[PDB]
Amino acid sequence: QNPMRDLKIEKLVLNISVGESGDRLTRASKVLEQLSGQTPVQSKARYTVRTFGIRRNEKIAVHVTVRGPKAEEILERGLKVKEYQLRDRNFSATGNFGFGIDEHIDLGIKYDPSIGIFGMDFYVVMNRPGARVTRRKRCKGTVGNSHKTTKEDTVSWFKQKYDADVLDK
Amino acid sequence: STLIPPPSKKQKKEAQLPREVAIIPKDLPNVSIKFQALDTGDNALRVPGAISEKQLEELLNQLNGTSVPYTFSCTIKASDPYSSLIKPQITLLYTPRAVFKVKPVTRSSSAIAGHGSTILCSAFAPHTSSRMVTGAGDNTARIWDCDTQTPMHTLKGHYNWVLCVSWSPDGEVIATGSMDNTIRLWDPKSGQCLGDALRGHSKWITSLSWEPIHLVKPGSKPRLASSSKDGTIKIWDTVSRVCQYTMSGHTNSVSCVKWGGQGLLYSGSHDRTVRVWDINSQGRCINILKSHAHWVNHLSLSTDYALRIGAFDHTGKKPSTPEEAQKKALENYEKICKKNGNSEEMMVTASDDYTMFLWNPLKSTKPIARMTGHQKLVNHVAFSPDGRYIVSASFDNSIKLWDGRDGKFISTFRGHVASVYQVAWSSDCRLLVSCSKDTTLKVWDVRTRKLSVDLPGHKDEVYTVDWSVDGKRVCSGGKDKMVRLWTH
Amino acid sequence: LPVTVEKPIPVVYDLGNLAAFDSNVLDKNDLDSSNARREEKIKSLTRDNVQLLINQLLSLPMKTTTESVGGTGGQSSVMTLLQLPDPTTDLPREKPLPKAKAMTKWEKFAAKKGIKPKERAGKMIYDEASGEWVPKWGYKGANKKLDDQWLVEVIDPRTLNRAERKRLVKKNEKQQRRNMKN
Amino acid sequence: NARAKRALVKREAKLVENVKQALFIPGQSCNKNLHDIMVDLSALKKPDMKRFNRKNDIHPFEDMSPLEFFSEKNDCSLMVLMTSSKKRKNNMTFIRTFGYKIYDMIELMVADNFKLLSDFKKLTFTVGLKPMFTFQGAAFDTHPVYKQIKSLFLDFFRGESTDLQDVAGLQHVISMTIQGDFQDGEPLPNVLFRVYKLKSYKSDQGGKRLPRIELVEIGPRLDFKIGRIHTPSPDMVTEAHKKPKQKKNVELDIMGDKLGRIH
Amino acid sequence: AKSSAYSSRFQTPFRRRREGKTDYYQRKRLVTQHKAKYNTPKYRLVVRFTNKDIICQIISSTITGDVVLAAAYSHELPRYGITHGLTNWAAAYATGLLIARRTLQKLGLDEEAVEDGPRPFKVFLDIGLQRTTTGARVFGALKGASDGGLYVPHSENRFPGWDFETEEIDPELLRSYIFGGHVSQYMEELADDDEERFSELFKGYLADDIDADSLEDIYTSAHEAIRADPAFKPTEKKFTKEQYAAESKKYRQTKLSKEERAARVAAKIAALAGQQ
RNA sequence: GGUUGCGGCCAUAUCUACCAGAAAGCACCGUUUCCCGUCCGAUCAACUGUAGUUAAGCUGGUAAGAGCCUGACCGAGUAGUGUAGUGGGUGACCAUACGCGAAACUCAGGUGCUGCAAUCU
RNA sequence: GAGAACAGAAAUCUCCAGUAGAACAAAAGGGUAAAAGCCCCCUUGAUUUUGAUUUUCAGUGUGAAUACAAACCAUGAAAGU
């Protein structure tokens, strides 16, 4: 049965990791800003690596989370770029999914030669109503088995609205 | 913090012994008892065994045939109320209460901000303790909703300070005296200008007193009386908005005015002179009282608490018609008035000669008694509601209690550090609030003659106080801008 | 309704710990475990002692303050708390008395040449250029100017001072241990 | 840096002392009837109290070092060990220490006719007030075992000492009563532990001052049977009963005023 | 996978604790008033906010697990004449104005005590698990109690209209929230802008046909009514204890014997073992 | 009896995998003007009880489940051990006696009890 | 452990786990779990005044160190710490 345990999107999370910090970092930030309206967040490096040329607490990467209609627009707009064709992987066992594009111009958006090119990480995390149980402060709980999002149920959902193709074995 | 110093090695071993108990041995010795009223009558000899003071009511009430409970005293050397008999025949002194208990005012509600200046005056409504008006050194007055601790109509009109305010005893009209030249009558509910402002006095307004209800005809509004620094007094009619008769006996400024019991204005003035002023003569003087070596500040009457409230007793349960309001106004008056079955209103004055003279103006233009005691000037005087104790505020940081009937000294309240500006009573005639040049207000237990509770709160000088008639609530106002309300 | 309670023997009290010691003679077969009417006798016996304990306590003196509204560690005006005595009853203490009195070598010497120990005002020494005050030990020390500042005059000069501080810090933390021992 | 100093500041010695902290240990042979009585007895000594979950192998009169080991760890002078056996059924062993060393021991075996807070009618109370006390017996004064039991329960259940005391706090009373008088030679009688809540009434024959007190039971009802008893050494009494130390013809007046008699 | 040894090893948090509603760390501090300086009884106004509902509760502290002196509720307000806006701040303040009257009324001071007198009832406010923020409806209920003349110590701060960048309060802004005039203003906004949303929200009010300006005045009247009759009344009820019980047990599943379980296994080893 | 809120004991209350829930009450839920906080109305904040739903949470039931707890002459009067004997033995250590006396092991039963206030076909 | 373009043994995001191979100033042994770990907001401290320690040459109603107590200060809606 399903009335109302449907399959809404929790959130889209766009992400750009940068090898270096400086102009090229704050410009990647600026891309996520004007695309989201929201100010993005700068993750720091967790330890020093050396073969990547990075140090503990360097500021290495920006990202932004987007929820509700604006999420679905940028989803589909990027989803276009990927030919409406993902893979049999791409979907997690717990019923989320993601993809990338390279070149941030292939989905609206002009170029500007004083900004350069980046690409993006798209990641789409799914739920039903009552996911709040595992997220609110008061009466905090864990969601029961036959309410959990799965790979089967999300792929079926994807194959339907959007109309897109799965690919691979 | 300088301490109360510690108990000594012997004084511990005093305390460590078991002792005393309350006991009451039995107690049945047959000691003779006389009964006496503080008014006049002696009533003649019983001789029972010893009993609790609750029972000596029930012995009296069947004898006189009332059901009125009664307060008791004995040994008048001493003056102090088995509880007597441990101190050693007994002349028992009985006296009526008006049965009640107004509570000790302890806690603040948090400080109500508003107008951005010092607060000059602050009067409760008579009929309810929710409604309370304040006059500031900002040109606005403001009426506060006191249950919710918030402004009920921020009120505008004047173009200088507002020095005194008063609520009419029927409770229809508020009046606001000003540092310019004007009086503005207000409705509480609308908060709007009732016609044009009352203009007539040439300099600023000093105090405002209402014509009380039991004189005024049932289905006519009470007239206002207004004293001013030019020295005249005018009598304002609220409906027509025009003065009937200016009255111009005093040469210097009039410090305050009061409307009396029997159609008689009293006006305490800066020409060292107190003018008893009949209304029926249409602006005319009858008697001119002279004692003081300095000017006269303030003028208290025995009836003034009853005349201020006018019909609305502590419940605030309203009169259904003006003909009822006549009788309710007359009955609250005639609780206090007939003390020996005769309308003997006492008048009392303060002045900078450090002295209060006691007056009975209908009987004699001489004074009765000279209350002399204070070092620096007395400022406020107050009768207690029942006309029984007088108390007066002074600039030597101390408040002196004087018996009302004979102007005889009782005691002094000590506690205040800096100069005391004004005082007010609890309606039951037990507690007594006072305000100072320092932060603190204090409340004074009159029965034990002692400090009940100090209450700090304000950041600066505190000019005005008043106690609500029911006796939940006490207001305050002063130099730090914030109106604090105080409660149990 | 009757409050006062006679006994044969007087009761010996302890109003510090709040206790009433009763030496009056008990019956066996009242308090024997076979008895049906056992407990009401213990209630009847105790109620007397508790009444006698209270009838002392209410006849004590009591504090009655005039302070009110946030008496920040004390009582309101219209409480009225009862002034108890100390315990007569001698407990044993939890731990032995805190008296590990050594002299510690300095203070021996500071007796023999006194050296009245000092007025001890506060941290902040005065700097001249800068105009402002600035301590000393605390923050931006008159200790650590030489490390931060920019030229020295007359092998490095700064790290010699970073050594020669830590010698004196070692020396104090060493000179503890002998006085900790002895 | 200065957190776990304040542990050692509290755990160090002190002139005006803290509350003696209770520790209820389940032994090897504990059982559910005893585990109730533990908690019912603990509920009075709240807050100043700790319980274990585990069942520990201890034998007080054989070997003491685990008890000092627990006492020194937790900083808890009052210890109660729970044992049970066919000799000593429901054996509550009460221990106190002096500087993490054993002061005394006393074995109280609980009788079969105990009653718990669940059983009685449940009535008003407050968490961790001062109790009142009554001790019914001359033997409490005279006889050294009962002096030691008198020395226990006051030290156990009083909590914080104070100079100054409210009316409304005086809600309930502990009652210790020795089971009848006895002569030397005989068996030692039981000690009856009863707990009453007060109810005032307006008495008339007292008046306004003195009320009529009426007691009501709430429990826990316990009846203690005495076992083996380890007493302190006479020097250690002289150490333990010692004041902190903290004038002739010289008196403070009122107003301070250090006056001196000439004579 | 879990190692069976580990499942034994771990020690459960407090059963009530484990439950999200209630927190044991906070309780300890409320367990003892001080309690070293003096011995005193303790009263606390426990406030929780439940969906479609307002609840206010006041609880003695006791090793029994406590007793309640007074009980205040949103369903009472309809009896006082307010159906509407239970979730709103204004409604919470009324609950405070009301709770205090009933306890005072039962306590009997207006309308073992010795050496005087009435005494002033002091109640330390419960936190709950709610976050602390200025203009919280929790703190609205606190302010309600103050009209009642209950004393918890407080700040003007956590009311709405508290200026961050100066230590000041507006009583007019606080006055609006008591009435719910601010909520009424939003209704006015909805009336002027759109009516799709207006149908959806305040639909019950609209059935009443009450107006926002009038509602403020209606709210004012209700406060007055509460003071007049704060004693409380209990509903008479339809259907007994026993019926409610009986109808409930129609849908309440019930135990089994070892004997029944023994058959189920024997039955199982008959079927699922012996060669299909 | 069910349910909410507060709890006392703090696993007979938890964990793993399934199943059921009439009423009311919890709950999920809808909305971003107001006070408020976020990278984000997801958390928190406020507003409504309307558009919906028992799908979870929650509460019961189910299982020779995983654990935990109680009872016992199940193991066992066993180990350990105070005390006594010019007991034994080259020693290591162990019987005799007068007294106390565990735990695993093994079998049997159970799977949360209950204080206060309101509200339900 | 399972996923996401560039992206790899180590770059960030997301879901489920470590009863604590969390780091609790330390050392262990216990238990805090809406913490004492990590992150953000708000702020003096070697305060001043009096009984027990001890030292003075103007024995300086204590002048100053030291032990304790009380007012105060900080923070929080408070309980408090």
Short mmCIF file of N, CA, C and O (backbone and C1' of nucleotides) in Angstrom, two decimals, chain F residues 39-85:
data_model
loop_
_atom_site.label_atom_id
_atom_site.label_comp_id
_atom_site.label_asym_id
_atom_site.label_seq_id
_atom_site.Cartn_x
_atom_site.Cartn_y
_atom_site.Cartn_z
P C F 39 25.24 28.70 8.72
"O5'" C F 39 24.64 28.67 7.24
"C5'" C F 39 25.12 29.56 6.22
"C4'" C F 39 24.99 28.91 4.86
"C3'" C F 39 23.63 28.32 4.52
"O3'" C F 39 22.76 29.31 3.97
"C1'" C F 39 25.38 26.81 3.91
P C F 40 21.53 29.88 4.83
"O5'" C F 40 20.40 28.77 4.63
"C5'" C F 40 19.60 28.72 3.43
"C4'" C F 40 19.19 27.30 3.12
"C3'" C F 40 18.07 26.72 3.98
"O3'" C F 40 16.80 27.02 3.40
"C1'" C F 40 19.84 25.12 3.64
P G F 41 15.80 28.07 4.08
"O5'" G F 41 14.76 27.14 4.85
"C5'" G F 41 15.20 26.02 5.65
"C4'" G F 41 14.10 25.57 6.59
"C3'" G F 41 12.90 24.89 5.93
"O3'" G F 41 12.42 23.83 6.74
"C1'" G F 41 12.17 26.78 7.13
P A F 42 11.74 22.53 6.08
"O5'" A F 42 12.97 21.53 5.92
"C5'" A F 42 12.77 20.11 5.78
"C4'" A F 42 13.75 19.35 6.64
"C3'" A F 42 13.87 19.78 8.10
"O3'" A F 42 12.83 19.24 8.93
"C1'" A F 42 16.03 19.55 7.19
P U F 43 12.31 20.05 10.20
"O5'" U F 43 13.61 20.17 11.13
"C5'" U F 43 14.09 19.04 11.89
"C4'" U F 43 15.33 19.41 12.67
"C3'" U F 43 15.15 20.44 13.77
"O3'" U F 43 14.62 19.87 14.96
"C1'" U F 43 17.12 20.92 12.53
P C F 44 13.22 20.39 15.54
"O5'" C F 44 13.53 21.91 15.90
"C5'" C F 44 14.28 22.25 17.08
"C4'" C F 44 14.73 23.69 17.04
"C3'" C F 44 13.65 24.76 17.01
"O3'" C F 44 12.97 24.93 18.25
"C1'" C F 44 15.38 25.35 15.52
P A F 45 11.42 25.35 18.26
"O5'" A F 45 11.43 26.74 17.49
"C5'" A F 45 11.93 27.93 18.13
"C4'" A F 45 11.67 29.14 17.25
"C3'" A F 45 10.22 29.38 16.85
"O3'" A F 45 9.50 30.00 17.91
"C1'" A F 45 11.60 29.57 14.95
P A F 46 8.26 29.24 18.61
"O5'" A F 46 6.99 29.92 17.92
"C5'" A F 46 6.81 31.35 17.95
"C4'" A F 46 6.48 31.88 16.57
"C3'" A F 46 5.08 31.55 16.06
"O3'" A F 46 4.14 32.48 16.60
"C1'" A F 46 6.67 31.14 14.35
P C F 47 2.73 31.98 17.15
"O5'" C F 47 1.92 31.67 15.82
"C5'" C F 47 1.51 32.75 14.96
"C4'" C F 47 0.96 32.22 13.65
"C3'" C F 47 -0.15 31.19 13.74
"O3'" C F 47 -1.41 31.79 14.02
"C1'" C F 47 1.41 30.55 12.07
P U F 48 -2.58 30.92 14.69
"O5'" U F 48 -2.89 29.82 13.58
"C5'" U F 48 -3.81 30.07 12.50
"C4'" U F 48 -4.09 28.80 11.74
"C3'" U F 48 -4.73 27.67 12.54
"O3'" U F 48 -6.13 27.89 12.68
"C1'" U F 48 -3.03 26.83 11.09
P G F 49 -6.93 27.28 13.93
"O5'" G F 49 -6.98 25.72 13.60
"C5'" G F 49 -7.88 25.22 12.60
"C4'" G F 49 -7.62 23.75 12.33
"C3'" G F 49 -8.23 22.77 13.33
"O3'" G F 49 -8.88 21.69 12.66
"C1'" G F 49 -5.91 22.36 13.12
P U F 50 -10.40 21.84 12.14
"O5'" U F 50 -10.23 22.50 10.70
"C5'" U F 50 -9.92 21.70 9.54
"C4'" U F 50 -9.48 22.58 8.39
"C3'" U F 50 -9.03 21.84 7.14
"O3'" U F 50 -10.15 21.53 6.31
"C1'" U F 50 -7.46 23.54 7.69
P A F 51 -10.32 20.06 5.69
"O5'" A F 51 -9.09 19.95 4.69
"C5'" A F 51 -9.13 20.55 3.38
"C4'" A F 51 -7.97 20.07 2.53
"C3'" A F 51 -7.72 18.56 2.52
"O3'" A F 51 -8.60 17.88 1.62
"C1'" A F 51 -5.67 19.72 2.78
P G F 52 -9.07 16.39 1.94
"O5'" G F 52 -7.69 15.62 2.18
"C5'" G F 52 -7.60 14.54 3.12
"C4'" G F 52 -6.25 13.87 3.02
"C3'" G F 52 -6.02 12.70 3.95
"O3'" G F 52 -6.77 11.54 3.53
"C1'" G F 52 -4.19 14.18 4.11
P U F 53 -6.07 10.27 2.85
"O5'" U F 53 -5.01 9.79 3.94
"C5'" U F 53 -3.88 8.98 3.57
"C4'" U F 53 -3.02 8.69 4.78
"C3'" U F 53 -3.60 7.71 5.79
"O3'" U F 53 -3.37 6.37 5.37
"C1'" U F 53 -2.56 9.56 6.90
P U F 54 -4.46 5.23 5.65
"O5'" U F 54 -4.61 5.26 7.24
"C5'" U F 54 -4.28 4.12 8.06
"C4'" U F 54 -2.79 4.10 8.34
"C3'" U F 54 -2.33 3.04 9.34
"O3'" U F 54 -1.01 2.59 9.06
"C1'" U F 54 -1.95 5.19 10.24
P A F 55 -0.73 1.54 7.87
"O5'" A F 55 -0.11 2.46 6.72
"C5'" A F 55 0.66 1.90 5.65
"C4'" A F 55 2.11 2.32 5.75
"C3'" A F 55 2.73 2.31 7.14
"O3'" A F 55 3.20 1.00 7.48
"C1'" A F 55 3.23 4.36 6.07
P A F 56 3.71 0.67 8.96
"O5'" A F 56 5.13 1.38 9.02
"C5'" A F 56 5.81 1.59 10.27
"C4'" A F 56 6.85 2.68 10.13
"C3'" A F 56 7.40 3.24 11.45
"O3'" A F 56 8.55 2.52 11.88
"C1'" A F 56 6.57 5.02 10.14
P G F 57 8.64 1.96 13.38
"O5'" G F 57 8.53 3.28 14.26
"C5'" G F 57 9.66 4.16 14.42
"C4'" G F 57 9.26 5.42 15.16
"C3'" G F 57 8.79 5.24 16.59
"O3'" G F 57 9.87 5.13 17.51
"C1'" G F 57 7.34 6.73 15.44
P C F 58 9.83 4.05 18.70
"O5'" C F 58 8.40 4.31 19.37
"C5'" C F 58 8.15 5.47 20.18
"C4'" C F 58 6.70 5.50 20.64
"C3'" C F 58 6.17 4.23 21.28
"O3'" C F 58 6.56 4.16 22.65
"C1'" C F 58 4.60 5.05 19.71
P U F 59 6.85 2.74 23.34
"O5'" U F 59 5.42 2.04 23.33
"C5'" U F 59 4.39 2.46 24.25
"C4'" U F 59 3.09 1.75 23.95
"C3'" U F 59 3.09 0.24 24.14
"O3'" U F 59 2.90 -0.11 25.51
"C1'" U F 59 2.00 0.81 22.10
P G F 60 3.50 -1.48 26.09
"O5'" G F 60 3.10 -2.54 24.97
"C5'" G F 60 2.89 -3.93 25.26
"C4'" G F 60 1.65 -4.44 24.55
"C3'" G F 60 1.75 -5.83 23.94
"O3'" G F 60 1.39 -6.83 24.89
"C1'" G F 60 1.00 -4.31 22.30
P G F 61 2.32 -8.11 25.11
"O5'" G F 61 2.10 -8.95 23.77
"C5'" G F 61 0.87 -9.66 23.54
"C4'" G F 61 0.76 -10.07 22.09
"C3'" G F 61 1.73 -11.15 21.63
"O3'" G F 61 1.28 -12.45 21.98
"C1'" G F 61 1.63 -9.40 20.02
P U F 62 2.34 -13.63 22.24
"O5'" U F 62 3.11 -13.74 20.85
"C5'" U F 62 2.54 -14.46 19.74
"C4'" U F 62 3.44 -14.40 18.53
"C3'" U F 62 4.76 -15.15 18.63
"O3'" U F 62 4.56 -16.54 18.38
"C1'" U F 62 5.11 -13.02 17.62
P A F 63 5.34 -17.64 19.25
"O5'" A F 63 6.83 -17.53 18.71
"C5'" A F 63 7.18 -17.97 17.38
"C4'" A F 63 8.66 -17.85 17.16
"C3'" A F 63 9.54 -18.63 18.15
"O3'" A F 63 10.59 -19.32 17.48
"C1'" A F 63 10.19 -16.36 18.10
P A F 64 10.45 -20.88 17.15
"O5'" A F 64 10.76 -21.58 18.55
"C5'" A F 64 12.11 -21.65 19.06
"C4'" A F 64 12.12 -22.36 20.39
"C3'" A F 64 13.36 -22.16 21.25
"O3'" A F 64 13.28 -20.95 22.00
"C1'" A F 64 12.74 -24.46 21.21
P G F 65 14.62 -20.26 22.56
"O5'" G F 65 15.32 -19.69 21.25
"C5'" G F 65 14.77 -18.56 20.55
"C4'" G F 65 15.72 -18.09 19.48
"C3'" G F 65 16.95 -17.33 19.97
"O3'" G F 65 18.08 -18.19 20.10
"C1'" G F 65 15.71 -15.96 18.49
P A F 66 19.06 -18.06 21.37
"O5'" A F 66 19.71 -16.62 21.17
"C5'" A F 66 20.83 -16.42 20.28
"C4'" A F 66 21.29 -14.98 20.32
"C3'" A F 66 21.81 -14.47 21.66
"O3'" A F 66 23.16 -14.87 21.91
"C1'" A F 66 20.33 -12.87 20.74
P G F 67 23.67 -15.07 23.42
"O5'" G F 67 22.99 -13.87 24.20
"C5'" G F 67 23.30 -13.57 25.57
"C4'" G F 67 22.91 -12.14 25.89
"C3'" G F 67 22.61 -11.84 27.35
"O3'" G F 67 23.79 -11.47 28.06
"C1'" G F 67 20.83 -11.06 26.00
P C F 68 24.08 -12.04 29.53
"O5'" C F 68 22.95 -11.34 30.42
"C5'" C F 68 22.94 -9.91 30.62
"C4'" C F 68 21.61 -9.48 31.21
"C3'" C F 68 21.22 -10.10 32.53
"O3'" C F 68 21.84 -9.41 33.62
"C1'" C F 68 19.37 -10.14 31.05
P C F 69 22.09 -10.16 35.02
"O5'" C F 69 20.62 -10.48 35.53
"C5'" C F 69 19.83 -9.49 36.22
"C4'" C F 69 18.47 -10.05 36.57
"C3'" C F 69 18.44 -11.15 37.61
"O3'" C F 69 18.56 -10.62 38.93
"C1'" C F 69 16.96 -11.67 35.83
P U F 70 19.05 -11.55 40.15
"O5'" U F 70 17.81 -12.53 40.37
"C5'" U F 70 16.64 -12.10 41.08
"C4'" U F 70 15.54 -13.13 40.99
"C3'" U F 70 15.75 -14.41 41.79
"O3'" U F 70 15.43 -14.22 43.16
"C1'" U F 70 14.93 -14.94 39.63
P G F 71 16.12 -15.15 44.28
"O5'" G F 71 15.60 -16.61 43.90
"C5'" G F 71 14.32 -17.09 44.36
"C4'" G F 71 14.13 -18.54 43.98
"C3'" G F 71 15.16 -19.53 44.49
"O3'" G F 71 14.93 -19.86 45.85
"C1'" G F 71 14.61 -20.01 42.22
P A F 72 16.11 -20.44 46.76
"O5'" A F 72 16.43 -21.85 46.09
"C5'" A F 72 15.67 -23.03 46.44
"C4'" A F 72 16.22 -24.24 45.72
"C3'" A F 72 17.67 -24.59 46.02
"O3'" A F 72 17.82 -25.26 47.27
"C1'" A F 72 17.22 -24.82 43.70
P C F 73 19.28 -25.63 47.82
"O5'" C F 73 19.53 -27.09 47.24
"C5'" C F 73 20.85 -27.66 47.19
"C4'" C F 73 20.79 -29.16 47.40
"C3'" C F 73 19.77 -29.92 46.57
"O3'" C F 73 20.28 -30.18 45.26
"C1'" C F 73 19.69 -30.66 48.82
P C F 74 19.33 -30.84 44.15
"O5'" C F 74 20.12 -30.55 42.80
"C5'" C F 74 19.86 -31.30 41.60
"C4'" C F 74 20.75 -30.82 40.47
"C3'" C F 74 22.24 -30.81 40.76
"O3'" C F 74 22.80 -32.11 40.53
"C1'" C F 74 21.60 -28.77 39.71
P G F 75 23.94 -32.68 41.49
"O5'" G F 75 25.12 -31.63 41.30
"C5'" G F 75 25.98 -31.68 40.14
"C4'" G F 75 26.99 -30.56 40.17
"C3'" G F 75 27.84 -30.43 41.43
"O3'" G F 75 28.90 -31.37 41.48
"C1'" G F 75 27.11 -28.29 40.74
P A F 76 29.07 -32.32 42.76
"O5'" A F 76 29.04 -31.30 43.98
"C5'" A F 76 29.65 -31.64 45.24
"C4'" A F 76 29.03 -30.87 46.38
"C3'" A F 76 27.50 -30.87 46.45
"O3'" A F 76 27.05 -31.05 47.79
"C1'" A F 76 28.29 -28.66 46.50
P G F 77 26.72 -32.51 48.34
"O5'" G F 77 26.61 -32.28 49.92
"C5'" G F 77 27.76 -32.41 50.79
"C4'" G F 77 28.69 -31.23 50.64
"C3'" G F 77 29.87 -31.19 51.60
"O3'" G F 77 31.03 -30.71 50.94
"C1'" G F 77 28.60 -29.23 51.84
P U F 78 32.50 -31.10 51.46
"O5'" U F 78 33.42 -30.80 50.20
"C5'" U F 78 33.39 -31.67 49.05
"C4'" U F 78 33.81 -30.94 47.80
"C3'" U F 78 34.88 -29.86 47.95
"O3'" U F 78 36.18 -30.44 48.04
"C1'" U F 78 33.14 -29.09 46.52
P A F 79 37.25 -29.88 49.10
"O5'" A F 79 37.78 -28.55 48.40
"C5'" A F 79 38.57 -28.63 47.20
"C4'" A F 79 38.60 -27.29 46.49
"C3'" A F 79 39.33 -26.17 47.21
"O3'" A F 79 40.74 -26.23 47.02
"C1'" A F 79 37.25 -25.37 46.37
P G F 80 41.74 -25.88 48.22
"O5'" G F 80 41.26 -24.42 48.68
"C5'" G F 80 41.58 -23.26 47.90
"C4'" G F 80 40.95 -22.02 48.49
"C3'" G F 80 41.30 -21.71 49.94
"O3'" G F 80 42.54 -21.01 50.02
"C1'" G F 80 38.95 -21.52 49.64
P U F 81 43.62 -21.40 51.13
"O5'" U F 81 42.86 -21.09 52.50
"C5'" U F 81 42.54 -19.74 52.88
"C4'" U F 81 41.66 -19.73 54.10
"C3'" U F 81 42.21 -20.43 55.33
"O3'" U F 81 43.12 -19.57 56.03
"C1'" U F 81 39.93 -21.01 55.02
P G F 82 43.94 -20.11 57.30
"O5'" G F 82 43.01 -19.71 58.53
"C5'" G F 82 42.84 -18.33 58.90
"C4'" G F 82 41.86 -18.21 60.04
"C3'" G F 82 42.25 -18.91 61.33
"O3'" G F 82 43.16 -18.14 62.10
"C1'" G F 82 39.97 -19.35 60.83
P U F 83 44.38 -18.85 62.87
"O5'" U F 83 43.66 -19.92 63.79
"C5'" U F 83 42.94 -19.52 64.97
"C4'" U F 83 42.28 -20.71 65.64
"C3'" U F 83 43.18 -21.88 65.99
"O3'" U F 83 43.91 -21.63 67.18
"C1'" U F 83 41.15 -22.67 65.04
P A F 84 45.29 -22.41 67.46
"O5'" A F 84 44.82 -23.91 67.67
"C5'" A F 84 44.24 -24.35 68.92
"C4'" A F 84 43.88 -25.81 68.87
"C3'" A F 84 45.06 -26.78 68.72
"O3'" A F 84 45.66 -27.00 69.99
"C1'" A F 84 43.29 -27.41 67.27
P G F 85 47.24 -27.27 70.11
"O5'" G F 85 47.38 -28.77 69.59
"C5'" G F 85 47.16 -29.89 70.47
"C4'" G F 85 47.37 -31.20 69.75
"C3'" G F 85 48.72 -31.40 69.08
"O3'" G F 85 49.73 -31.76 70.02
"C1'" G F 85 46.98 -32.17 67.66
#
